[PDB]
Symmetry: C6
Subunit: 219 residues, 6 copies
């Protein structure tokens, strides 16, 4: 990654064995559960495009997801090229060439070039741009590998309401939807799919009851 | 987090894999036992709002608690907005816009903005403000997930007094006293404690009922 | 904790995950064996009152001991208030308010105030003062939870003298007594409670025999 | 490795026990699966030729692969010598002799010489040149140790399409496409994929054959 | 310990949780086998007397050995006092009082005083002096806890000579030679070693009795 | 070890618990397999003679090898004394006494003296000289403890050629021979000791076939 030294300068640092192992292990243990994505984002904090490719390439197996990831990356890279055409011309001494989509993705750019873009003033955050593409692709993989639909999450006749809300928002989280969609799904299904006894208790709370009040009422 | 380097400047530093793993593991092993909250506070020392959201988002499962957390955060964010109305106007050079509730919560603010507020002179500690909201929400989760009432913690007829006080104050901590303790002791220890008189310390009470 | 940087200044540093885990694990594995106290002291090296409260609060269970700990802290805090009454008046720019007992204990003082006291010239070591109170309370807990009295430590007819001395000073250590009391208990019980065969050998060594000579004689 | 300190100078640093153990363990657990190579590249970040030889030499067993590695290294070293003839002559003050192939490979060069080439202005990155040769040799080992041909990867009659694509591109990675994928799908999924038309993404193909 | 920072000044640093755990674990697993002493010396590198007392005090059990350690420390402390009589008088600015034996042992000296002696010019290495006393006491414990005499280490009639030399010098290290080795070899290897003549190296002796 | 700070000066640093544990564990798990030697060299990077003695002394058991190690060290130390006689005379202020063989081995030299030799300009690398002696002794131990001769490595009638080459060069590596000897042993035994079917295939490849071609041919 690119870290700041004690001279105020942003300096490249080697990816650590702790970071490499942590990412490999979380993929082995959790596959593509929704919480793997924020773990990837945090483990790739300050990462260069080279570091991001390293984390993706160190993953063994799951090559169907990795190949889908590469397709999303190429779609986003092509869009960047459509929006930012490179202007031919010799590069100035203190300047850097404008990055292509494949340069942001680390496939046609060197580490030195990525350091140059990231440590420029103003910086071109090719690592954060690339990470935005990878997470976009990881969101589709999580959504695709989600086994259960939110419509099929219904509270059992003897299931505690706490456990049913756990399954509800776990299934809802694997959708990788916006907060507006999450709130629309909550107002459409959480109360309506509760079991008969708890549903009656929740209807009498009104639409303005908080989840804390809802879980308390069906305790 | 935002840490001081070895020269004296407040500099952003990436959250470490050790910190990420420690928080994930303590939630996996302890869920939301009361001691998880001080662990969260210490692991999030100097954290930015982004770091706090990272720690919350890396938790798998417990999504009912996570959703309650988000509601408490939104309640506190709305209160901050009611108390700190935003003053429209262009931000001066070297200055920063006043943060909204959603800015403190890291949802409408960039990392650079959070670093700017935290490293300002005087600083606006959006990380500590956000952490205060999260811990407030985590306290509600602990109380809700507390299985036992303090009224049902009674010393067994042959239970050592030390073990009963352990269960008493463990239950009491989750439910978030000194005379209720004597009331729920067993008959034999209750008689000994009555003969101690008011003002006995817990050390003196436990000594008297050693058996 | 408060650590020194390379500018000669004492600077606050976040408590590390290694320190947090080490303290939690030693309490889980060793409870309140006597050697837990020096482990607590070392793990809390340079700790602020906030760090000390963090270590105590991260402990799950053992709440009877924790509650006794808080009582000892309050007794020591009240004594500090009796000995150091706070003088009302506005605080100077480069100065700090005098700490109360609850300020040393971290309950009515902020982290910034604790850093200010600890990094002052001369420093007010609220962390070391608080640690002195906690260890005082931990000493009472270890003494209370000690299962065996030193009077009941007697050498078996076929027990090796080495193992009996191990049990003797393990029991004696859980008393948390001064070295004078340890020496008084040694001169009163170690030889007198040895088994018949070894006791006769030790009597013929005289009161001036070292433990090395005593253990050698009954080998 | 050669790392930049916290002042800006490129300084040699000892290879860490964490790095040594990580490389030994990944070879023990994964042998020469394709993902071992990017792990080697990352663990050898900034490595000198001495560090690269250290990592290779700490591997126990797999000596047939290690011996193939040495042959590939010697082939690349000889090519470097053919392309960069050494110019005889005394080296000037503050200058360094041009490295031979065996110097890049760390066998005829001292650590000081490798540090000098890597920290020169302009630098001669003998570590990155050497690493390029090693990875070239590691690629040959992966290809040789690949057990299955892509022609033999066919979807089972009741095998989930997701698992078949996993095996397809795992085999394809070791053998180091989009229409071969459809050809080797089972009859039921093949009919669905034919009806998708050319230009379907892998996401669309996997969605269609979800079953 | 007292370590040099990255600018050149000797600065006190807290003993690390890694060091504390490593010392506790090696005592738990190895007790007082001879190799524990060099482990103690290395783990206590640059240690102050306070750090040395911390490491000794974190040991659970083995209190008979710990009590022998304290007696040896007191014997060495008394000798230091006999050799270095304290000169009464007020300490000058920027100066330090001469340490007593109990000051070197960390029992009557503060951490600041130990840092002052160790960082003085010239330094008084109370940590290294104290460590010398502890290792002297640890050597007595190893000798006392050594179970086997070198006289009872004899090669079995069918025991490999390599394993017998292992036991010989392991016992010899705990008891803290080259002809005793030949004397306690079995008849078959003894005849081979007699025919080697005096002056044979251990390598030559082990080669001759390879069997 | 001796590490460089951020002042350009070579400064002594304490051996780390990670390094101490790693060396002890690799000896426990791998004994004197050939790959233990490069692990020792890397773990002792920048080590002083004191650090090298620490690593050797922390090893429990294997005292026959340790005692052979000490004999090789003494032979190399005596040779150094024969080649570098010490010139008597008072040492200058900014100078250091010339090291003896026992000084390089850390037995008659202090840590400060070893730091002085290693950080001098020009430096006297007593750590690298001592490490050269230890590795020389470790090479003899590995060679002595090797169970199998290269002459007895023959391919089984149904053994894959890949596995036979593994055993060949594992046995050959435990000889600790020069690359010339390794190439001479390869040209003398690898093809000649292959099984009948693979041997005929390899003879038809010619002496100029690479190992990659040889392993491919007998796949
Ligand atoms: Cl690391
Ligand atoms: Cl995986
Ligand atoms: Cl994310
Ligand atoms: Cl790859
Ligand atoms: Cl880490
Ligand atoms: Cl808290
Ligand atoms: Cl998320
Ligand atoms: Cl840590
Ligand atoms: Cl516990
Ligand atoms: Cl203590
Ligand atoms: Cl708490
Ligand atoms: Cl390390
Ligand atoms: Cl690669
Ligand atoms: Cl080697
Ligand atoms: Cl640590
Ligand atoms: Cl030692
Ligand atoms: Cl103690
Ligand atoms: Cl360490
Ligand atoms: Cl061993
Ligand atoms: Cl080597
Ligand atoms: Cl030793």
């Amino acid at each position: 990654p690119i870290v700041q030294n004690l001279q105020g300068q942003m300096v490249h640092q080697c990816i650590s064995p702790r970071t490499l192992n942590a990412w490999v292990k979380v993929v082995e243990e959790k596959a593509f559960s929704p919480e793997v994505i924020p773990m990837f984002s945090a483990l790739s904090c300050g990462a260069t495009p080279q570091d991001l490719n390293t984390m993706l390439n160190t993953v063994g197996g799951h090559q169907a997801a990795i190949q889908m990831l590469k397709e999303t990356i190429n779609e986003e890279a092509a869009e960047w090229d459509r929006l930012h055409p490179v202007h031919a011309g010799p590069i100035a001494p203190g300047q850097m060439r404008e990055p292509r989509g494949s340069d942001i993705a680390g496939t046609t750019s060197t580490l030195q070039e990525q350091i140059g873009w990231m440590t420029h003033n103003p910086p071109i955050p090719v690592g954060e741009i690339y990470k935005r593409w990878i997470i976009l692709g990881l969101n589709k993989i999580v959504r695709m590998y989600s086994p259960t639909s939110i419509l099929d999450i219904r509270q059992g006749p003897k299931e505690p309401f706490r456990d049913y809300v756990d399954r509800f928002y776990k299934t809802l989280r694997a959708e990788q939807a916006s907060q507006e969609v999450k709130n629309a799904a909550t107002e459409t299904l959480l109360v309506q799919n509760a079991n008969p006894d708890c549903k009656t208790i929740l209807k009498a709370l009104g639409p303005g009851a908080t989840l804390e009040e809802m879980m308390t009422a069906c305790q």
